[PDB]
Amino acid sequence: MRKQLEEARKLSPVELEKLVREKKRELMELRFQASIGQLSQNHKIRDLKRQIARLLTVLNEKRRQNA
RNA sequence: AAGAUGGUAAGGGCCCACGGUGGAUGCCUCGGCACCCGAGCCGAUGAAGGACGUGGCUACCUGCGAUAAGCCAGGGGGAGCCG
């Protein structure tokens, strides 16, 4: 959804790395707990893999502004 | 008493019906063939062609490559979709 790109265009220098470290953390427990809880997701593994890629496109756009 | 002496089928044949095994003929085709026209090179910014991985659960083809049944901009389209 566009509201993540609403705010992600602002954050230029270094904080966008540690803001996607924790969003990898947020799928680590989903990938662990897809063998016990295992049901109320199937949103959650495939939504996060898209909202990491749409935060790592802008991270290289805002470095090809330099190179 | 001297009779053409004859009616039986472990089994065999010919013909007529009724079923099994087999896959020819008829009718089709998302696949080919031969002539015509539009067109006619990619590559160390690393090619043609491949190995291995990627779906919540996956064996095999297709699509993609650690962002991996995908991401960001521009146009078309107008309604149901997650090969």
Side-chain angles (χ1 to χ4, degrees):
Chain A
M1 194 66 72
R2 67 177 64 87
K3 78 276 197 181
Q4 300 179 2
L5 281 80
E6 281 287 330
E7 65 94 17
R9 301 284 185 181
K10 310 297 193 294
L11 277 66
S12 177
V14 75
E15 61 268 13
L16 201 60
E17 295 176 355
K18 72 175 182 289
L19 201 141
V20 80
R21 298 291 192 269
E22 189 68 29
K23 205 176 291 293
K24 289 183 181 290
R25 289 289 179 274
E26 189 175 358
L27 59 80
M28 279 189 67
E29 281 87 10
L30 295 167
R31 194 177 68 248
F32 277 6
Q33 206 175 3
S35 65
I36 294 95
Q38 82 193 358
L39 200 149
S40 296
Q41 59 266 23
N42 303 322
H43 310 282
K44 309 293 179 66
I45 293 96
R46 200 176 68 187
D47 286 331
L48 268 73
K49 296 172 79 69
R50 310 295 184 90
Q51 69 182 353
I52 292 167
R54 70 178 66 252
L55 269 69
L56 267 73
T57 293
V58 64
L59 186 62
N60 205 357
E61 176 182 359
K62 301 180 80 69
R63 290 186 68 252
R64 70 179 57 248
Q65 69 93 27
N66 204 168

Short mmCIF file of all heavy atoms in Angstrom, two decimals, chain A residues 14-54:
data_model
loop_
_atom_site.label_atom_id
_atom_site.label_comp_id
_atom_site.label_asym_id
_atom_site.label_seq_id
_atom_site.Cartn_x
_atom_site.Cartn_y
_atom_site.Cartn_z
N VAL A 14 20.79 6.81 6.78
CA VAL A 14 21.26 5.55 7.34
C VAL A 14 20.14 4.82 8.07
O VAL A 14 20.23 3.61 8.32
CB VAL A 14 22.47 5.79 8.26
CG1 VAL A 14 22.04 6.39 9.60
CG2 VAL A 14 23.31 4.53 8.45
N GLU A 15 19.06 5.53 8.41
CA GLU A 15 18.03 4.95 9.26
C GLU A 15 17.19 3.92 8.53
O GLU A 15 16.58 3.06 9.18
CB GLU A 15 17.14 6.06 9.82
CG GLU A 15 16.41 6.86 8.77
CD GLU A 15 17.18 8.09 8.34
OE1 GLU A 15 18.38 8.19 8.66
OE2 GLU A 15 16.58 8.96 7.67
N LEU A 16 17.20 3.96 7.20
CA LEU A 16 16.38 3.04 6.43
C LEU A 16 16.95 1.63 6.45
O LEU A 16 16.23 0.68 6.15
CB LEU A 16 16.25 3.59 5.01
CG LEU A 16 15.09 3.10 4.16
CD1 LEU A 16 13.81 3.47 4.86
CD2 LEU A 16 15.16 3.75 2.79
N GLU A 17 18.22 1.47 6.84
CA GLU A 17 18.77 0.14 7.05
C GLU A 17 18.22 -0.49 8.32
O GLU A 17 17.72 -1.62 8.31
CB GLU A 17 20.29 0.22 7.11
CG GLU A 17 20.94 0.67 5.83
CD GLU A 17 22.43 0.81 5.97
OE1 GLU A 17 22.94 0.66 7.11
OE2 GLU A 17 23.10 1.09 4.96
N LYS A 18 18.30 0.24 9.44
CA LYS A 18 17.81 -0.33 10.69
C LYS A 18 16.29 -0.33 10.77
O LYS A 18 15.75 -0.93 11.70
CB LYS A 18 18.37 0.42 11.89
CG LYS A 18 17.79 1.80 12.11
CD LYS A 18 18.33 2.39 13.39
CE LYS A 18 17.72 3.74 13.65
NZ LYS A 18 18.23 4.75 12.70
N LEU A 19 15.61 0.33 9.84
CA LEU A 19 14.16 0.19 9.79
C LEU A 19 13.72 -1.02 8.97
O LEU A 19 12.55 -1.41 9.05
CB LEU A 19 13.55 1.49 9.26
CG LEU A 19 12.08 1.83 9.52
CD1 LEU A 19 11.97 3.31 9.80
CD2 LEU A 19 11.21 1.48 8.33
N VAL A 20 14.63 -1.67 8.24
CA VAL A 20 14.30 -2.94 7.59
C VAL A 20 14.96 -4.13 8.28
O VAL A 20 14.53 -5.28 8.04
CB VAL A 20 14.67 -2.90 6.09
CG1 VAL A 20 16.14 -3.14 5.87
CG2 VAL A 20 13.79 -3.85 5.27
N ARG A 21 15.95 -3.91 9.15
CA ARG A 21 16.41 -4.97 10.05
C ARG A 21 15.27 -5.53 10.90
O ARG A 21 15.06 -6.75 10.98
CB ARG A 21 17.51 -4.45 10.98
CG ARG A 21 18.77 -3.95 10.32
CD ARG A 21 19.56 -5.07 9.71
NE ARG A 21 20.89 -4.63 9.32
CZ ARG A 21 21.20 -4.14 8.13
NH1 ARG A 21 20.26 -4.02 7.20
NH2 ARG A 21 22.44 -3.77 7.86
N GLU A 22 14.50 -4.64 11.54
CA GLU A 22 13.39 -5.09 12.38
C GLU A 22 12.24 -5.64 11.54
O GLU A 22 11.48 -6.49 12.02
CB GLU A 22 12.92 -3.93 13.26
CG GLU A 22 11.91 -4.32 14.35
CD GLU A 22 12.51 -5.20 15.43
OE1 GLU A 22 13.73 -5.10 15.69
OE2 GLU A 22 11.77 -6.00 16.04
N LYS A 23 12.12 -5.22 10.29
CA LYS A 23 11.08 -5.81 9.47
C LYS A 23 11.50 -7.15 8.87
O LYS A 23 10.66 -7.86 8.32
CB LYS A 23 10.66 -4.80 8.40
CG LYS A 23 9.24 -4.98 7.88
CD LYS A 23 8.88 -3.90 6.90
CE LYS A 23 8.74 -2.57 7.60
NZ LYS A 23 7.58 -2.57 8.52
N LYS A 24 12.79 -7.50 8.95
CA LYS A 24 13.19 -8.90 8.79
C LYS A 24 12.92 -9.70 10.07
O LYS A 24 12.54 -10.89 10.00
CB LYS A 24 14.66 -8.99 8.40
CG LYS A 24 14.95 -8.53 7.00
CD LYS A 24 16.42 -8.72 6.65
CE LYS A 24 16.72 -8.24 5.24
NZ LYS A 24 16.09 -9.14 4.23
N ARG A 25 13.14 -9.06 11.23
CA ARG A 25 12.79 -9.68 12.51
C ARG A 25 11.33 -10.07 12.58
O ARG A 25 11.00 -11.15 13.08
CB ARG A 25 13.07 -8.75 13.68
CG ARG A 25 14.49 -8.54 13.95
CD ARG A 25 15.07 -9.80 14.52
NE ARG A 25 16.47 -9.60 14.78
CZ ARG A 25 17.40 -9.79 13.85
NH1 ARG A 25 17.05 -10.18 12.63
NH2 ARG A 25 18.67 -9.59 14.15
N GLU A 26 10.45 -9.23 12.03
CA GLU A 26 9.02 -9.45 12.13
C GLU A 26 8.58 -10.68 11.34
O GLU A 26 7.56 -11.29 11.67
CB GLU A 26 8.29 -8.19 11.68
CG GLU A 26 6.79 -8.16 11.91
CD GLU A 26 6.18 -6.82 11.55
OE1 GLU A 26 6.93 -5.90 11.17
OE2 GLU A 26 4.94 -6.69 11.65
N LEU A 27 9.34 -11.09 10.32
CA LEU A 27 9.02 -12.36 9.67
C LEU A 27 9.80 -13.54 10.22
O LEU A 27 9.44 -14.68 9.90
CB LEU A 27 9.23 -12.29 8.14
CG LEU A 27 10.52 -11.97 7.38
CD1 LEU A 27 11.49 -13.12 7.26
CD2 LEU A 27 10.12 -11.53 5.98
N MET A 28 10.87 -13.31 11.00
CA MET A 28 11.55 -14.46 11.62
C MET A 28 10.63 -15.26 12.54
O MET A 28 10.64 -16.50 12.50
CB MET A 28 12.79 -14.03 12.40
CG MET A 28 14.00 -13.82 11.54
SD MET A 28 15.47 -13.57 12.55
CE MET A 28 15.60 -15.20 13.29
N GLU A 29 9.82 -14.60 13.36
CA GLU A 29 8.93 -15.37 14.23
C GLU A 29 7.76 -15.97 13.47
O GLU A 29 7.24 -17.01 13.89
CB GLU A 29 8.42 -14.53 15.40
CG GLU A 29 9.44 -14.38 16.52
CD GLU A 29 10.36 -13.22 16.29
OE1 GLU A 29 10.07 -12.44 15.37
OE2 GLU A 29 11.37 -13.10 17.00
N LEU A 30 7.34 -15.37 12.36
CA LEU A 30 6.34 -16.00 11.52
C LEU A 30 6.88 -17.29 10.91
O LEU A 30 6.19 -18.31 10.87
CB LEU A 30 5.90 -15.05 10.41
CG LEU A 30 5.17 -13.78 10.82
CD1 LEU A 30 5.12 -12.86 9.65
CD2 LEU A 30 3.77 -14.13 11.26
N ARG A 31 8.14 -17.26 10.49
CA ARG A 31 8.72 -18.44 9.88
C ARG A 31 9.02 -19.52 10.92
O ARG A 31 8.96 -20.71 10.60
CB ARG A 31 9.98 -18.05 9.11
CG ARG A 31 10.47 -19.12 8.17
CD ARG A 31 11.66 -18.64 7.38
NE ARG A 31 12.82 -18.45 8.23
CZ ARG A 31 13.35 -17.27 8.52
NH1 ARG A 31 12.80 -16.17 8.03
NH2 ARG A 31 14.41 -17.19 9.30
N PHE A 32 9.35 -19.13 12.16
CA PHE A 32 9.40 -20.13 13.23
C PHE A 32 8.02 -20.70 13.52
O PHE A 32 7.84 -21.92 13.56
CB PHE A 32 9.97 -19.55 14.53
CG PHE A 32 11.47 -19.52 14.59
CD1 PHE A 32 12.24 -19.87 13.51
CD2 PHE A 32 12.10 -19.25 15.80
CE1 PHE A 32 13.62 -19.87 13.60
CE2 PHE A 32 13.47 -19.25 15.90
CZ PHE A 32 14.23 -19.57 14.80
N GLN A 33 7.03 -19.84 13.71
CA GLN A 33 5.74 -20.24 14.26
C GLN A 33 4.74 -20.61 13.16
O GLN A 33 3.54 -20.68 13.41
CB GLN A 33 5.22 -19.11 15.16
CG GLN A 33 4.26 -19.53 16.28
CD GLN A 33 3.90 -18.37 17.19
OE1 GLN A 33 4.31 -17.23 16.95
NE2 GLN A 33 3.13 -18.66 18.23
N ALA A 34 5.22 -20.87 11.95
CA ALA A 34 4.39 -21.53 10.95
C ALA A 34 4.33 -23.04 11.12
O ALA A 34 3.93 -23.74 10.18
CB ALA A 34 4.88 -21.19 9.55
N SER A 35 4.74 -23.57 12.28
CA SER A 35 4.62 -24.98 12.59
C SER A 35 3.85 -25.26 13.87
O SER A 35 3.68 -26.43 14.24
CB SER A 35 6.02 -25.62 12.69
OG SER A 35 6.75 -25.09 13.78
N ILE A 36 3.38 -24.22 14.58
CA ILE A 36 2.52 -24.41 15.74
C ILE A 36 1.21 -23.63 15.57
O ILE A 36 0.13 -24.22 15.51
CB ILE A 36 3.22 -24.01 17.05
CG1 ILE A 36 4.41 -24.93 17.36
CG2 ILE A 36 2.24 -24.04 18.21
CD1 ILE A 36 5.76 -24.44 16.89
N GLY A 37 1.31 -22.30 15.48
CA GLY A 37 0.14 -21.45 15.38
C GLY A 37 -0.50 -21.56 14.02
O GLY A 37 -1.70 -21.83 13.90
N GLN A 38 0.29 -21.29 12.98
CA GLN A 38 0.24 -21.89 11.65
C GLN A 38 -1.03 -21.67 10.83
O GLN A 38 -1.11 -22.15 9.70
CB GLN A 38 0.52 -23.41 11.73
CG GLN A 38 -0.64 -24.33 12.13
CD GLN A 38 -0.18 -25.72 12.47
OE1 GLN A 38 1.01 -26.03 12.38
NE2 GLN A 38 -1.11 -26.57 12.89
N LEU A 39 -2.03 -20.95 11.35
CA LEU A 39 -3.30 -20.89 10.63
C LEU A 39 -3.74 -19.48 10.29
O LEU A 39 -4.13 -19.22 9.15
CB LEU A 39 -4.38 -21.61 11.46
CG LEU A 39 -5.67 -22.11 10.79
CD1 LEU A 39 -6.15 -23.35 11.51
CD2 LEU A 39 -6.77 -21.08 10.78
N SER A 40 -3.70 -18.55 11.24
CA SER A 40 -4.31 -17.24 11.03
C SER A 40 -3.48 -16.34 10.13
O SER A 40 -3.96 -15.28 9.71
CB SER A 40 -4.56 -16.56 12.37
OG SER A 40 -5.50 -17.30 13.13
N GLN A 41 -2.25 -16.74 9.81
CA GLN A 41 -1.47 -16.13 8.76
C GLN A 41 -1.83 -16.75 7.41
O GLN A 41 -2.92 -17.32 7.27
CB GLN A 41 0.04 -16.22 9.05
CG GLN A 41 0.64 -17.62 9.23
CD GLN A 41 0.69 -18.05 10.68
OE1 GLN A 41 -0.06 -17.56 11.51
NE2 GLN A 41 1.63 -18.92 10.99
N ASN A 42 -0.90 -16.63 6.45
CA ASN A 42 -0.93 -16.71 4.98
C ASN A 42 -1.29 -15.35 4.41
O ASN A 42 -1.27 -15.19 3.20
CB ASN A 42 -1.88 -17.77 4.39
CG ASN A 42 -1.58 -19.15 4.90
OD1 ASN A 42 -0.43 -19.52 5.07
ND2 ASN A 42 -2.62 -19.93 5.14
N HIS A 43 -1.59 -14.37 5.25
CA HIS A 43 -1.33 -12.99 4.87
C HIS A 43 0.16 -12.72 4.95
O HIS A 43 0.78 -12.20 4.01
CB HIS A 43 -2.04 -12.04 5.83
CG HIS A 43 -3.49 -12.33 6.06
ND1 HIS A 43 -4.47 -12.01 5.16
CD2 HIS A 43 -4.12 -12.90 7.11
CE1 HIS A 43 -5.64 -12.37 5.64
NE2 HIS A 43 -5.46 -12.92 6.82
N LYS A 44 0.74 -13.14 6.06
CA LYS A 44 1.81 -12.41 6.73
C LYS A 44 3.18 -12.75 6.18
O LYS A 44 4.09 -11.92 6.26
CB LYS A 44 1.76 -12.72 8.22
CG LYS A 44 0.41 -12.52 8.83
CD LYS A 44 -0.01 -11.09 8.81
CE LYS A 44 -1.38 -10.95 9.42
NZ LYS A 44 -1.37 -11.31 10.87
N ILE A 45 3.37 -13.95 5.66
CA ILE A 45 4.67 -14.26 5.09
C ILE A 45 4.83 -13.58 3.74
O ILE A 45 5.88 -13.02 3.44
CB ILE A 45 4.87 -15.79 5.01
CG1 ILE A 45 4.97 -16.40 6.41
CG2 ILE A 45 6.12 -16.14 4.24
CD1 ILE A 45 3.68 -16.98 6.97
N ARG A 46 3.76 -13.53 2.95
CA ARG A 46 3.91 -12.97 1.62
C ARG A 46 3.68 -11.46 1.58
O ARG A 46 4.15 -10.81 0.64
CB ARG A 46 2.97 -13.69 0.64
CG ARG A 46 3.36 -13.53 -0.82
CD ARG A 46 2.47 -14.32 -1.74
NE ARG A 46 1.12 -13.79 -1.77
CZ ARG A 46 0.11 -14.39 -2.39
NH1 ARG A 46 0.31 -15.53 -3.02
NH2 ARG A 46 -1.09 -13.84 -2.38
N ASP A 47 3.02 -10.87 2.58
CA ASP A 47 2.94 -9.41 2.60
C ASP A 47 4.28 -8.78 2.97
O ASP A 47 4.67 -7.74 2.40
CB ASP A 47 1.86 -8.96 3.57
CG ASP A 47 0.49 -9.20 3.03
OD1 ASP A 47 0.34 -9.17 1.80
OD2 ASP A 47 -0.45 -9.41 3.82
N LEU A 48 5.00 -9.38 3.91
CA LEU A 48 6.25 -8.79 4.36
C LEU A 48 7.35 -8.91 3.32
O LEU A 48 8.21 -8.03 3.23
CB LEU A 48 6.69 -9.41 5.68
CG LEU A 48 6.20 -8.69 6.92
CD1 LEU A 48 4.73 -8.87 7.19
CD2 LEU A 48 7.02 -9.16 8.09
N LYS A 49 7.34 -9.97 2.50
CA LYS A 49 8.37 -10.09 1.48
C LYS A 49 8.20 -9.07 0.38
O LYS A 49 9.17 -8.76 -0.32
CB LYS A 49 8.36 -11.51 0.92
CG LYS A 49 8.73 -12.54 1.96
CD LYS A 49 8.56 -13.96 1.47
CE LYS A 49 9.69 -14.40 0.59
NZ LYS A 49 10.94 -14.56 1.39
N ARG A 50 6.99 -8.51 0.23
CA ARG A 50 6.80 -7.39 -0.69
C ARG A 50 7.15 -6.07 -0.01
O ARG A 50 7.77 -5.19 -0.64
CB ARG A 50 5.36 -7.36 -1.18
CG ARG A 50 4.83 -8.67 -1.70
CD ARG A 50 5.52 -9.16 -2.93
NE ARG A 50 4.89 -10.38 -3.41
CZ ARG A 50 3.89 -10.39 -4.29
NH1 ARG A 50 3.42 -9.26 -4.78
NH2 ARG A 50 3.36 -11.54 -4.67
N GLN A 51 6.76 -5.89 1.25
CA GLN A 51 7.08 -4.61 1.89
C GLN A 51 8.51 -4.54 2.42
O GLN A 51 8.84 -3.58 3.11
CB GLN A 51 6.08 -4.27 2.99
CG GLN A 51 6.14 -5.12 4.24
CD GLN A 51 5.08 -4.73 5.25
OE1 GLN A 51 4.39 -3.73 5.08
NE2 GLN A 51 4.94 -5.53 6.30
N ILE A 52 9.35 -5.54 2.16
CA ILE A 52 10.79 -5.34 2.27
C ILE A 52 11.39 -4.90 0.94
O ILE A 52 12.28 -4.04 0.90
CB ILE A 52 11.45 -6.63 2.80
CG1 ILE A 52 11.03 -6.87 4.24
CG2 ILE A 52 12.96 -6.56 2.74
CD1 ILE A 52 11.37 -8.23 4.72
N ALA A 53 10.90 -5.46 -0.17
CA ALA A 53 11.41 -5.09 -1.48
C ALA A 53 11.04 -3.65 -1.84
O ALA A 53 11.84 -2.93 -2.46
CB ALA A 53 10.89 -6.05 -2.54
N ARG A 54 9.87 -3.20 -1.42
CA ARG A 54 9.53 -1.82 -1.72
C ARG A 54 10.16 -0.84 -0.74
O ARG A 54 9.94 0.37 -0.87
CB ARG A 54 8.01 -1.63 -1.75
CG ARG A 54 7.33 -1.74 -0.42
CD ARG A 54 5.84 -1.49 -0.54
NE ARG A 54 5.15 -2.51 -1.32
CZ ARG A 54 4.68 -2.30 -2.54
NH1 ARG A 54 4.84 -1.12 -3.11
NH2 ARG A 54 4.06 -3.28 -3.19
#
